[PDB]
Amino acid sequence: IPLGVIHNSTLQVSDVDKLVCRDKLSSTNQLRSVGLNLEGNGVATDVPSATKRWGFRSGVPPKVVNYEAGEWAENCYNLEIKKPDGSECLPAAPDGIRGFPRCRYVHKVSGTGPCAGDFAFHKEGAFFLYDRLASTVIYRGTTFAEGVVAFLILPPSSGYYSTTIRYQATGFGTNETEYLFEVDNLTYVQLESRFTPQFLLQLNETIYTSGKRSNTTGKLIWKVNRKIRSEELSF
Amino acid sequence: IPLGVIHNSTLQVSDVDKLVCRDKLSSTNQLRSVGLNLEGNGVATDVPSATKRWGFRSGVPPKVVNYEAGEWAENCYNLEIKKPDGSECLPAAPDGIRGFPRCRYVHKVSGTGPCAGDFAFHKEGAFFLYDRLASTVIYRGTTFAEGVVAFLILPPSSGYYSTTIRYQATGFGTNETEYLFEVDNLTYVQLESRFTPQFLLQLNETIYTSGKRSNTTGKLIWKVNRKIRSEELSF
Amino acid sequence: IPLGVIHNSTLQVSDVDKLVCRDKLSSTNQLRSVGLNLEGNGVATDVPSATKRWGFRSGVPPKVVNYEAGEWAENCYNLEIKKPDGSECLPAAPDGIRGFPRCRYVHKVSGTGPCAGDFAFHKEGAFFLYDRLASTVIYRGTTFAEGVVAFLILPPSSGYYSTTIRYQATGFGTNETEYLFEVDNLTYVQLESRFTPQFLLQLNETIYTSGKRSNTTGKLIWKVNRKIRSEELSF
Amino acid sequence: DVKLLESGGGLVQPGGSLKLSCAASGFSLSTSGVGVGWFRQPSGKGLEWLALIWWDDDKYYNPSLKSQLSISKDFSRNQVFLKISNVDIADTATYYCARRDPFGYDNAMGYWGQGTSVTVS
Amino acid sequence: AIVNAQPKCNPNLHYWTTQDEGAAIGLAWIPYFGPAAEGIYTEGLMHNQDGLICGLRQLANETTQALQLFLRATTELRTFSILNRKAIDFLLQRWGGTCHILGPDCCIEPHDW
Amino acid sequence: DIQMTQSPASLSVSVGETVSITCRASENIYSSLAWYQQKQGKSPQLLVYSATILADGVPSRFSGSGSGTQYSLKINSLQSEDFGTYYCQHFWGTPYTFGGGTKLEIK
Amino acid sequence: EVQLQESGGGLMQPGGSMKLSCVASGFTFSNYWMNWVRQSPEKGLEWVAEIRLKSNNYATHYAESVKGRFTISRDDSKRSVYLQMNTLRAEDTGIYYCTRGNGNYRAMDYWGQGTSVTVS
Amino acid sequence: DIVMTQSPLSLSTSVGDRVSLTCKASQNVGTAVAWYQQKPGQSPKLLIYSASNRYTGVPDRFTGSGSGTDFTLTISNMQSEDLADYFCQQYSSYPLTFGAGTKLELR
Ligand SMILES: *[C@@H]1O[C@H](CO)[C@@H](O[C@@H]2O[C@H](CO)[C@@H](O[C@@H]3O[C@H](CO[C@H]4O[C@H](CO)[C@@H](O)[C@H](O)[C@@H]4O)[C@@H](O)[C@H](O[C@H]4O[C@H](CO)[C@@H](O)[C@H](O)[C@@H]4O)[C@@H]3O)[C@H](O)[C@H]2NC(C)=O)[C@H](O)[C@H]1NC(C)=O
Ligand SMILES: *[C@@H]1O[C@H](CO)[C@@H](O[C@@H]2O[C@H](CO)[C@@H](O[C@@H]3O[C@H](CO)[C@@H](O)[C@H](O[C@H]4O[C@H](CO)[C@@H](O)[C@H](O)[C@@H]4O)[C@@H]3O)[C@H](O)[C@H]2NC(C)=O)[C@H](O)[C@H]1NC(C)=O
Ligand SMILES: *[C@@H]1O[C@H](CO)[C@@H](O[C@@H]2O[C@H](CO)[C@@H](O[C@@H]3O[C@H](CO)[C@@H](O)[C@H](O[C@H]4O[C@H](CO)[C@@H](O)[C@H](O)[C@@H]4O)[C@@H]3O)[C@H](O)[C@H]2NC(C)=O)[C@H](O)[C@H]1NC(C)=O
Ligand SMILES: *[C@@H]1O[C@H](CO)[C@@H](O[C@@H]2O[C@H](CO)[C@@H](O[C@@H]3O[C@H](CO)[C@@H](O)[C@H](O[C@H]4O[C@H](CO)[C@@H](O)[C@H](O)[C@@H]4O)[C@@H]3O)[C@H](O)[C@H]2NC(C)=O)[C@H](O)[C@H]1NC(C)=O
Ligand SMILES: *[C@@H]1O[C@H](CO)[C@@H](O[C@@H]2O[C@H](CO)[C@@H](O[C@@H]3O[C@H](CO)[C@@H](O)[C@H](O)[C@@H]3O)[C@H](O)[C@H]2NC(C)=O)[C@H](O)[C@H]1NC(C)=O
Ligand SMILES: *[C@@H]1O[C@H](CO)[C@@H](O[C@@H]2O[C@H](CO)[C@@H](O)[C@H](O)[C@H]2NC(C)=O)[C@H](O)[C@H]1NC(C)=O
Ligand SMILES: *[C@@H]1O[C@H](CO)[C@@H](O[C@@H]2O[C@H](CO)[C@@H](O)[C@H](O)[C@H]2NC(C)=O)[C@H](O)[C@H]1NC(C)=O
Ligand SMILES: *[C@@H]1O[C@H](CO)[C@@H](O[C@@H]2O[C@H](CO)[C@@H](O)[C@H](O)[C@H]2NC(C)=O)[C@H](O)[C@H]1NC(C)=O
Ligand SMILES: *[C@@H]1O[C@H](CO)[C@@H](O)[C@H](O)[C@H]1NC(C)=O
Ligand SMILES: *[C@@H]1O[C@H](CO)[C@@H](O)[C@H](O)[C@H]1NC(C)=O
Ligand SMILES: *[C@@H]1O[C@H](CO)[C@@H](O)[C@H](O)[C@H]1NC(C)=O
């Protein structure tokens, strides 16, 4: 495994057959294993694509690795998904696991679907990052921010209190999977694509105000396109 | 973290900007992480003060650290304390935890009180020492001897079978907390202060002999000051 | 702990007071901790002797150690033994434990006996090898191949799908212990000694063919010596 | 020569449950392949089968009663047991324990319990 | 520099390892498209050239005996490493001594002009 | 105890000829098997270390094969220095066993 | 190079006893165990006995056809070996050898010149 | 499940009668059958083992025969002490089955 090297104010690859002393490791505190946010590569954040990126495998056991502190994520996820028969799906997090420190918008999902396999796994192999431990597998509950890790040789409440967007899932891990936004105990809006957290956040302009607000014994789903809100377009 | 260094037959602090070869680490077996007994600093051993030294915090998770073998303790403690509603308080010890090897007088306590928080913690941050693992948190049951740890660079049945003094607690973790000595299924003596383990041990001169010995359907508490024993001064 | 050293194309013992540079550790990937199969020393594989080699101790806690990949075993064992009162005996394997990768003939045993102690232990101290972790203790279920470990400094489905011989135990951990081979829900043959896995395998020449085959409401035991098969010699 | 001993539950209400047991005071039951079992004779009726238990840890039941019948044992005390869900008047019978007698060939059982009985009310 | 115990050495070494350099396809880097959990194993054969295999068994037995005590002395439960520590002492045995040429160390090359 | 045999009981040869010797035995999981030769007036000398590893100072011409009940000795070509008789043995542990040997007859 | 030499051979009357022996140098005894073998035109080479290293508490073995007719001894300060024949019965006329070798090979890699021992 | 029957369902007897009883079944028991004797207040004691061997300590008055689905029990020289409810049982298949039984009365 190659290490980044900072020298002549640029990155250099450690994997050479001569280690010239121009780079020196005076102490172990020059070492870093910092995590990086996958999102920083411009990777799409639509929740449907997030689902597309997870493998749903059974077979080989999960592993985790310790890593150095790293960059903030705008988007992160919490998951409650269960199998259609009401079986729990995906293991409870192991001791010492807690959600990532700085997500701006943790997305929370619940609902059921086939939830194939037992250990999930990222289709690209990207790490899930929980606090300071990278993982190859998704844990229940707590937030995982997709990312990668690198190793290099070195020469206020809103920072975590922010978080919006909780929604239901219909099916899971398959092409047929669908999501519906939920506010005020109302399931609504298909969330198909192209919606930033703020795009969705502004939809709360309708909550207890400009629309929706099913003041009935049950909740009504609106199909997103008022045209967008799709008020009274529920079926 | 500084390391002790033995050189010129004296301790020296490792944290210097030049490491002169006069000190040499020929092998890793010169290294030591030995624990030290807090009691060796003359710290009071009265059980009420021991209680005063524990924080009762909830919040940050417990941690432990491996350490080298170390000095004998005259006083150590076992704890069964529970919340007033009968809830268990403080986690069961983790695997591989066992009581300190050489305590002369393990003190055992049981009873209930508010037992605030969930992880206790030492108010001075002193380590709890279980066998070979230092801890920031108190575990149920097994003995922890208060201590600290240091790292330095180096150039018969009674040893564990001894142990006396088991007693009840009234309340816990608060100024109002009180303790009563117990022998022969009798709760007695407030144990307020100034009592060495031997001071208390000699009080067994009354057991089945010179006093107390409530040969009744119940047990009577005596309030310590025969004046000390406070025989028949129970209320 | 001495390390093997390969130099001048021969093994050499690392424990010398001078480390001549003729041996060089250019990287950590020259290091190996490889396991070795005890069976490669000609040690008997009769199941009764395997039982003779296990201590059945209670007392000191189990430990395991990580080790490098190593040689194939012809014989390995799985165990379901329980105490005579129906108590489980021996702990379930810890997480990450799985059976050895290449056993040709895993032997499986079930049944009950006194199963003295709680941690077993090898009488010679030989390691049990589970996957990549050596152990001082037997775990339930999964295969352990007896072996030892060494550390040295360096300068298709049948490979695991093979496996035969499952049998009952009568008593356990004691001189009186006895085993009976089982096929077709029939308990038979004392398996006293001298039987290679193939010696036993050829006995399936009788299954649904040349003998035994108790086509009754129950199964009959035959006492091994057709003379060997001991057909109709059950009592 | 084994002093097998009958034991069991007392009178029960119909729609109740029953526990039955026996013990082999004359034998350890440690020989492999030992089979013991239960059968019953309501009203002077023939040997209705109930269950089989093997020292090799094998269990069998009469399928007609199996839905409400379970086998248990306690070898450390040479004990065998039955549990019966939904005991009612159709379950009133004499009851017996049994053991292989020729031992090891064709079941050969054979050896019998003292006899007990169960009623409901 | 050791010789075999009365036990009988089988000179053959048939072994398996988890090592597998590279990847067959880029997706094989990914556990999702990775080999079955037993597929990691690879295997090979060695022969007792120069008595090495048999020597290895004896060495292993001695090492096992030494190791047993060390493990008793450990406090950690699963002892995942040791070799790293051994590498440290490999270096410590060679370093921190005075060392120009006169000391019997550091493999100093002969001096040219 | 393991029993063993060898064939041909002798082989007539010519110089530079490729030759081989069959040796058979009760099964031996050990590859411990080895070969040696002797000359009249001479103490036996090892030709190959157990299995196929050649004894030190043995010419590259020497070879061998097999495991279990069947194994062999091979020589790529012959030199007059190789005249003698040849053997194989069971060193699997104890008691040791030896082949009746063969004779290197000359054409 | 082993410096081995053999002694105590030659003709003896039947029904006797003798201690056939060897001596060697340049290969320390501390690293090995030794074997005696015998050969005849009528027999070919045959194993006679095994002498374990003191780590095995000097355990020994003999071919079953000769067992109890011979015992062995060794002296690791003298680097010497004894066949200690219990008997000199008959058919003992084959050439005797004593061998040693690397434990990671087998004892065949060293041998004596051999000796003749015969019975009348 | 498998049908078991016996006959005669009852038999009048007198001393010295040669008793003949039979047991029949839907399935070919193959001789894995046994016969039993019972009296009130008593266990159904074994009489016949494997369609032939009377159980040890059984008097030799008791003999039996047959294979497949057909079996018999007979009593030579019957004695009044032999009145009993008689049974048979199938050991070749299960759930276990037994004959409906028979009874005898001397007179
Ligand atoms: C590294 O490798 C060496 C071998 O090179 C191993 O050494 C073995 O060590 C064990 C003991 O640790 C030895 O076993 C002992 O054998 C004695 C003889 O058994 C034989 O004799 C009997 C009686 O005639 C025969 O029935 C049987 O077939 C054998 O021929 C036993 O008497 C010993 O038992 C006594 O002590 C043991 C240990 O306390 C008790 O458990 C017994 O109950 C009894 O009290 C003992 O079993 C073995 O012979 C050694 N072999 C060799 C070749 O040296 C090491 O074990 C190995 N290192 C490690 C750590 O595994
Ligand atoms: C859509 O609009 C509605 C308003 O029409 C909005 O509802 C509002 O939500 C906030 C937050 O829940 C409410 O204010 C809260 O009041 C409670 C009780 O006093 C406080 O405890 C809350 O403080 C906690 O949470 C804060 C925010 O995380 C923390 O900063 C703080 O430390 C506490 O943890 C909080 O102040 C407000 O009363 C309602 N108002 C109404 C009319 O509903 C809703 O949030 C909007 N939808 C979305 C998805 O944003
Ligand atoms: C106050 O005085 C009373 C006596 O008036 C005293 O009670 C005594 O306690 C000891 C210890 O419990 C008793 O002796 C024990 O007897 C049992 C049974 O035979 C033994 O098993 C005990 O041995 C175990 O414990 C020992 C001490 O730890 C170990 O050394 C040993 O290995 C065993 O583990 C032990 O010998 C004695 O009989 C009573 N006597 C009476 C009359 O009560 C009491 O201990 C005193 N109070 C205090 C707090 O010291
Ligand atoms: C003694 O002889 C009997 C035959 O008289 C023999 O029974 C045979 O066992 C094999 C294996 O169980 C049977 O073949 C199997 O058939 C099933 C169903 O189609 C397959 O699923 C099995 O395949 C699995 O197992 C294979 C072997 O491990 C794997 O290679 C494969 O990937 C699958 O996991 C298997 O093909 C066969 O039908 C019976 N035949 C009869 C007549 O019983 C028995 O095994 C012999 N006894 C012993 C102990 O060997
Ligand atoms: C199940 O296994 C039993 C046990 O072997 C089988 O019983 C056997 O049945 C055969 C067929 O009748 C018997 O052979 C017969 O023997 C008599 C004399 O003993 C002879 O007169 C007949 O001509 C015939 O050869 C055999 O004796 C009997 N027992 C044994 C051990 O062979 C049974 O057939 C098997 N089948 C089933 C479904 O039970
Ligand atoms: C979800 O996906 C499945 C498969 O991807 C769809 O079923 C396939 O549809 C295609 C045509 O688009 C057919 O050619 C295949 O034969 C079908 N089977 C397969 C490949 O699984 C299904 O229609 C999709 N439905 C939704 C709404 O997601
Ligand atoms: C236990 O402690 C509490 C507080 O330490 C006592 O209550 C306080 O008493 C002081 C006077 O000593 C008052 O000024 C405070 O207002 C009280 N409240 C506080 C500070 O908690 C209580 O009296 C003590 N009782 C006993 C017997 O322990
Ligand atoms: C199993 O072992 C025990 C003890 O090893 C046997 O009982 C001992 O038998 C010897 C004679 O062989 C007596 O001298 C001892 O006094 C007995 N008690 C001991 C030492 O435990 C027992 O007979 C053995 N039985 C079987 C069949 O394994
Ligand atoms: C939403 O519904 C739940 C029941 O599903 C109810 O407990 C809760 O009070 C509701 N939320 C609000 C804010 O009324
Ligand atoms: C003390 O009391 C307990 C019940 O709380 C009782 O079990 C025990 O026997 C008593 N102790 C003695 C030594 O009598
Ligand atoms: C063996 O017996 C078990 C019951 O103990 C039964 O479930 C199983 O079907 C039997 N095996 C076969 C292959 O019939």
PDB file of N, CA and C in Angstrom, chain A residues 38-68:
ATOM      1  N   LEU A  38     -16.395  10.822  -0.122  1.00  0.00           N
ATOM      2  CA  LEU A  38     -16.677  10.448  -1.501  1.00  0.00           C
ATOM      3  C   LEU A  38     -17.375  11.551  -2.276  1.00  0.00           C
ATOM      4  N   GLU A  39     -18.207  12.303  -1.569  1.00  0.00           N
ATOM      5  CA  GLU A  39     -18.985  13.409  -2.090  1.00  0.00           C
ATOM      6  C   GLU A  39     -18.122  14.499  -2.695  1.00  0.00           C
ATOM      7  N   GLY A  40     -16.864  14.577  -2.261  1.00  0.00           N
ATOM      8  CA  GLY A  40     -15.935  15.579  -2.747  1.00  0.00           C
ATOM      9  C   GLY A  40     -15.453  15.287  -4.154  1.00  0.00           C
ATOM     10  N   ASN A  41     -15.852  14.136  -4.700  1.00  0.00           N
ATOM     11  CA  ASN A  41     -15.551  13.791  -6.062  1.00  0.00           C
ATOM     12  C   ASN A  41     -16.727  14.106  -6.974  1.00  0.00           C
ATOM     13  N   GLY A  42     -17.722  14.828  -6.466  1.00  0.00           N
ATOM     14  CA  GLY A  42     -18.841  15.179  -7.315  1.00  0.00           C
ATOM     15  C   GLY A  42     -19.846  14.048  -7.488  1.00  0.00           C
ATOM     16  N   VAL A  43     -19.715  12.993  -6.695  1.00  0.00           N
ATOM     17  CA  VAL A  43     -20.612  11.861  -6.807  1.00  0.00           C
ATOM     18  C   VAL A  43     -22.020  12.267  -6.432  1.00  0.00           C
ATOM     19  N   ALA A  44     -22.998  11.791  -7.198  1.00  0.00           N
ATOM     20  CA  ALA A  44     -24.380  12.169  -6.966  1.00  0.00           C
ATOM     21  C   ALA A  44     -24.851  11.821  -5.568  1.00  0.00           C
ATOM     22  N   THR A  45     -25.690  12.694  -5.025  1.00  0.00           N
ATOM     23  CA  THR A  45     -26.245  12.506  -3.699  1.00  0.00           C
ATOM     24  C   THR A  45     -27.710  12.103  -3.686  1.00  0.00           C
ATOM     25  N   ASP A  46     -28.319  11.877  -4.850  1.00  0.00           N
ATOM     26  CA  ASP A  46     -29.718  11.479  -4.813  1.00  0.00           C
ATOM     27  C   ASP A  46     -29.827  10.169  -4.103  1.00  0.00           C
ATOM     28  N   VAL A  47     -30.798  10.087  -3.219  1.00  0.00           N
ATOM     29  CA  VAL A  47     -30.970   8.901  -2.432  1.00  0.00           C
ATOM     30  C   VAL A  47     -31.160   7.642  -3.244  1.00  0.00           C
ATOM     31  N   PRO A  48     -31.846   7.695  -4.383  1.00  0.00           N
ATOM     32  CA  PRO A  48     -31.962   6.554  -5.243  1.00  0.00           C
ATOM     33  C   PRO A  48     -30.622   6.087  -5.766  1.00  0.00           C
ATOM     34  N   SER A  49     -29.670   7.004  -5.953  1.00  0.00           N
ATOM     35  CA  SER A  49     -28.402   6.544  -6.455  1.00  0.00           C
ATOM     36  C   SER A  49     -27.581   5.977  -5.339  1.00  0.00           C
ATOM     37  N   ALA A  50     -27.853   6.437  -4.124  1.00  0.00           N
ATOM     38  CA  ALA A  50     -27.152   5.883  -3.000  1.00  0.00           C
ATOM     39  C   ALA A  50     -27.507   4.441  -2.856  1.00  0.00           C
ATOM     40  N   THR A  51     -28.781   4.146  -3.088  1.00  0.00           N
ATOM     41  CA  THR A  51     -29.234   2.786  -3.018  1.00  0.00           C
ATOM     42  C   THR A  51     -28.624   1.953  -4.111  1.00  0.00           C
ATOM     43  N   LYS A  52     -28.465   2.561  -5.286  1.00  0.00           N
ATOM     44  CA  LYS A  52     -27.843   1.871  -6.392  1.00  0.00           C
ATOM     45  C   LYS A  52     -26.421   1.490  -6.118  1.00  0.00           C
ATOM     46  N   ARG A  53     -25.760   2.228  -5.241  1.00  0.00           N
ATOM     47  CA  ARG A  53     -24.384   1.931  -4.930  1.00  0.00           C
ATOM     48  C   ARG A  53     -24.165   0.859  -3.883  1.00  0.00           C
ATOM     49  N   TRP A  54     -25.220   0.246  -3.344  1.00  0.00           N
ATOM     50  CA  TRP A  54     -24.993  -0.766  -2.313  1.00  0.00           C
ATOM     51  C   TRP A  54     -25.314  -2.174  -2.828  1.00  0.00           C
ATOM     52  N   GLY A  55     -24.358  -3.092  -2.647  1.00  0.00           N
ATOM     53  CA  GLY A  55     -24.411  -4.470  -3.159  1.00  0.00           C
ATOM     54  C   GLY A  55     -25.365  -5.545  -2.577  1.00  0.00           C
ATOM     55  N   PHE A  56     -25.726  -5.464  -1.294  1.00  0.00           N
ATOM     56  CA  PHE A  56     -26.623  -6.470  -0.681  1.00  0.00           C
ATOM     57  C   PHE A  56     -26.120  -7.921  -0.671  1.00  0.00           C
ATOM     58  N   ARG A  57     -24.820  -8.091  -0.607  1.00  0.00           N
ATOM     59  CA  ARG A  57     -24.172  -9.398  -0.535  1.00  0.00           C
ATOM     60  C   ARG A  57     -24.298 -10.152   0.793  1.00  0.00           C
ATOM     61  N   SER A  58     -24.229 -11.474   0.681  1.00  0.00           N
ATOM     62  CA  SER A  58     -24.102 -12.387   1.807  1.00  0.00           C
ATOM     63  C   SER A  58     -22.868 -13.208   1.513  1.00  0.00           C
ATOM     64  N   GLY A  59     -22.223 -13.754   2.532  1.00  0.00           N
ATOM     65  CA  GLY A  59     -20.954 -14.398   2.242  1.00  0.00           C
ATOM     66  C   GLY A  59     -19.860 -13.928   3.184  1.00  0.00           C
ATOM     67  N   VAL A  60     -18.845 -13.288   2.613  1.00  0.00           N
ATOM     68  CA  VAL A  60     -17.662 -12.889   3.355  1.00  0.00           C
ATOM     69  C   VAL A  60     -17.992 -11.915   4.471  1.00  0.00           C
ATOM     70  N   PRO A  61     -17.327 -12.060   5.616  1.00  0.00           N
ATOM     71  CA  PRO A  61     -17.463 -11.266   6.815  1.00  0.00           C
ATOM     72  C   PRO A  61     -16.997  -9.837   6.605  1.00  0.00           C
ATOM     73  N   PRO A  62     -17.592  -8.902   7.329  1.00  0.00           N
ATOM     74  CA  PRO A  62     -17.291  -7.490   7.404  1.00  0.00           C
ATOM     75  C   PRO A  62     -15.962  -7.224   8.069  1.00  0.00           C
ATOM     76  N   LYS A  63     -15.309  -6.134   7.689  1.00  0.00           N
ATOM     77  CA  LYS A  63     -14.099  -5.703   8.371  1.00  0.00           C
ATOM     78  C   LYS A  63     -14.093  -4.200   8.567  1.00  0.00           C
ATOM     79  N   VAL A  64     -13.363  -3.714   9.570  1.00  0.00           N
ATOM     80  CA  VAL A  64     -13.251  -2.268   9.710  1.00  0.00           C
ATOM     81  C   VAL A  64     -11.801  -1.862   9.880  1.00  0.00           C
ATOM     82  N   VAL A  65     -11.512  -0.590   9.614  1.00  0.00           N
ATOM     83  CA  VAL A  65     -10.171  -0.082   9.829  1.00  0.00           C
ATOM     84  C   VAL A  65     -10.160   1.291  10.455  1.00  0.00           C
ATOM     85  N   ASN A  66      -9.216   1.484  11.355  1.00  0.00           N
ATOM     86  CA  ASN A  66      -9.039   2.751  12.032  1.00  0.00           C
ATOM     87  C   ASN A  66      -8.500   3.806  11.105  1.00  0.00           C
ATOM     88  N   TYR A  67      -9.019   5.027  11.172  1.00  0.00           N
ATOM     89  CA  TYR A  67      -8.438   6.022  10.294  1.00  0.00           C
ATOM     90  C   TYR A  67      -8.404   7.404  10.928  1.00  0.00           C
ATOM     91  N   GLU A  68      -7.535   8.264  10.404  1.00  0.00           N
ATOM     92  CA  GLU A  68      -7.423   9.658  10.830  1.00  0.00           C
ATOM     93  C   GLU A  68      -8.557  10.559  10.469  1.00  0.00           C
TER      94      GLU A  68
END
